[PDB]
Design a binder for these strands. Structure first.
Ligand SMILES: NC(=O)CC[C@H](N)C(=O)NS(=O)(=O)OC[C@H]1O[C@@H](n2cnc3c(N)ncnc32)[C@H](O)[C@@H]1O
Length: 529
RNA sequence: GGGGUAUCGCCAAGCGGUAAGGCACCGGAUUCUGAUUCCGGCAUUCCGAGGUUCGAAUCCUCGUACCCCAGCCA
């Protein structure tokens, strides 16, 4: 529960509302990130928990910054997280005629006028955080002039920035938002929904309070930065002819360590080509996390754990990872894969190989078992073999033994190096009947695999606070290794995850996984304390 | 100027009754994944200083730290 749900519990009792109607209003100017997910869970979640409704609305009031590819990807991420919206998808653009009419009502009430102060002059006239603003020389035009002038704007008779429609409120308000905020500005740009029918587009504050009201929204849930805007929201609805008046509630936005959480910065990583795309597995975007191996259920869990409050916060990466581990640890089938392979021959072994049985999930027999090929020439991880090694080292030591996962116990004996003195092959012997512990893969039946290890995109906890966050990108946020996996992964599918025993959770696709050379993304490593 | 928030390393309950939970962490027990699972520990303190009260983190007062607002962006 959170303060917002508590308010709603009250409202229901008193009877202010008998139904709750929320909305998720993203602007299609980029892809959604994990923060947007916190918002999606909140609005859609509250709706379903209270047998209510939640609209998916595209706040598409700025043509030049938006693209149809963004609206497309947003519907996708909302669906993927497991949420359904009310009726058809909505667009603010659906209300452009409506907004135009409401602007005309304000002008008629002398509550709005066409200003001709250039874009620079408006800031010069606006005042400062400590000094009040001053009325524009065009502030007292007659209703008739404003009316004619607005029509000229709409008709395209003014060059961009040469004119705008402003609300007539209070140039001396301590609330900068109330200093005659702009309602409309000129833009000769094609809109992804309205094409070229308009050359004037409504501003955010004007559009949003009216959109909510026409949609019957009961609880407009937004983030803390729109707190000051609150008085403009109510001003507009109080001054036009509209029957409902939605209530606002702000909660703090999500921040995750070692990453950025704004579309502007995420876009720069995309445009400057420092990540493959919005959906790069290293990105905090919904799509990137999906591609990374996270389950929607893991994300919904995360959002449930972090809560909804009014306090600034930065969650630690451990928390998000904990969520994905809790999921995959329970549902992901296990398999063998060697990321850093080194040949190990069993001079003692006789034949072309045999078959050994391995549980698909140890702690869960109900998940079944599989048949895995074993032989005398296998691959183990270079890190699991040491010639010396101290006491705690429970792996393979030149002279000691180690149990090969779900197989036989073997003893290291003769190693073999090359030029630089690197080991090329490890010879051992196996105990005919014997069935630390290391994983392995039979070299003859092994599937050549590309393994992509990922890590924090940035080297610092708060890359957003850097002068140049790009210069603080982590050069090892992605390292590609070529390894070997048990033949069983031959049928692996994109999306589905597996636990590479003693390594971590991995999954296919990665946009690169083909038929010949499979590519696996390490979703997250195993807890190694 | 105006608007917010300050409870254990990171999140977060508590709305006058004398400090939930999660993540992280530190111990021990299981375990053919040094995983998991499993028991145990972890703020006598709630930004600070006063005041009212039988009694406050929860009310009031003065402070202090931090966040947001001066786009014809959202
Ligand atoms: N009052 C409002 O709702 C304004 C919505 C505005 N068009 C907007 O913010 N669009 S947006 O596409 O940028 O984001 C859409 C919603 O996502 C929320 N949001 C954005 N970043 C968030 C974050 N880091 N954590 C939690 N929530 C976050 C916004 O509040 C908005 O409602």
């Amino acid at each position: 529960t959170n303060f917002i749900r508590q308010i709603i519990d009250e409202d229901l009792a008193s009877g202010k509302h008998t139904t709750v109607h929320t909305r998720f209003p993203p602007e299609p100017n980029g892809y959604l990130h994990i923060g947007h997910a916190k918002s999606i869970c909140l609005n859609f979640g509250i709706a379903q928990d209270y047998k209510g409704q939640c609209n998916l609305r595209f706040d598409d009031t700025n043509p030049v910054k938006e693209d149809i590819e963004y609206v497309e990807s947003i519907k996708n991420d909302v669906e993927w997280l497991g949420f359904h919206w009310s009726g058809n998808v909505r667009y603010s653009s659906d209300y452009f005629d409506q907004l135009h009419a409401y602007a005309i009502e304000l002008i008629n009430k002398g509550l709005a006028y066409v200003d001709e102060l250039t874009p620079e002059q408006i800031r010069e006239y606006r005042g400062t955080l400590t000094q009040p603003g001053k009325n524009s020389p065009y502030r007292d035009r007659s209703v008739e002039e404003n009316l004619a002038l607005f029509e000229k704007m709409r008709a395209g008779g003014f060059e961009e920035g040469k004119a705008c429609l402003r609300a007539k409120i209070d140039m001396a308000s301590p609330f900068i938002v109330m200093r005659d905020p702009v309602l409309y500005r000129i833009k000769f740009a094609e809109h992804h929904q309205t094409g070229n029918k308009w050359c004037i587009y409504p501003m955010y504050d004007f559009t949003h309070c009216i959109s909510d009201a026409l949609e019957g929204i009961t609880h407009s849930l937004r983030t803390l930065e729109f707190q000051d805007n609150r008085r403009l929201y109510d001003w507009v609805l109080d001054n036009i002819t509209i029957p409902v008046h939605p209530r606002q509630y702000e909660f703090s936005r999500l921040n995750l360590e070692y990453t950025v959480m704004s579309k502007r910065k995420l876009n720069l990583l995309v445009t400057d080509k420092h990540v493959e795309g919005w959906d790069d597995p290293r990105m905090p975007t919904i799509s990137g996390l999906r591609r990374r191996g996270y389950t929607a259920a893991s994300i919904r869990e995360f959002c449930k754990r972090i809560g909804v409050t009014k306090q600034d916060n930065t969650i630690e990466m451990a928390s998000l990872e904990s969520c994905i581990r809790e999921d995959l640890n329970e549902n992901a089938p296990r398999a063998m894969a060697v990321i850093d392979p080194v040949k190990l021959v069993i001079e003692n072994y006789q034949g072309e190989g045999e078959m050994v049985t391995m549980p698909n999930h140890p702690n869960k027999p109900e998940m079944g078992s599989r048949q895995v090929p074993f032989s005398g020439e296998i691959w183990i991880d270079r890190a699991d073999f040491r010639e010396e090694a101290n006491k705690q080292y429970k792996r393979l030591v030149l002279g000691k033994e180690v149990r090969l996962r779900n197989a036989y116990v073997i003893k290291a004996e003769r190693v073999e190096k090359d030029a630089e003195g690197n080991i090329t092959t490890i010879f051992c012997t196996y105990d005919a009947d014997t069935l630390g512990v290391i994983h392995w893969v039979s070299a003859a039946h092994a599937l050549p695999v590309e393994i992509r290890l990922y890590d924090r995109l940035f080297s610092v906890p708060n890359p957003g606070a850097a002068d140049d966050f790009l210069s603080v990108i982590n050069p090892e946020s992605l390292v590609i290794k070529q390894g070997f996996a048990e033949p069983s992964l031959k049928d692996a599918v994109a999306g589905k995850a597996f636990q590479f025993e003693r390594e971590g959770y991995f999954c296919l696709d990665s946009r690169h996984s083909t038929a010949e050379k499979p590519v696996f993304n390490r979703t997250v490593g195993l807890r190694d304390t």
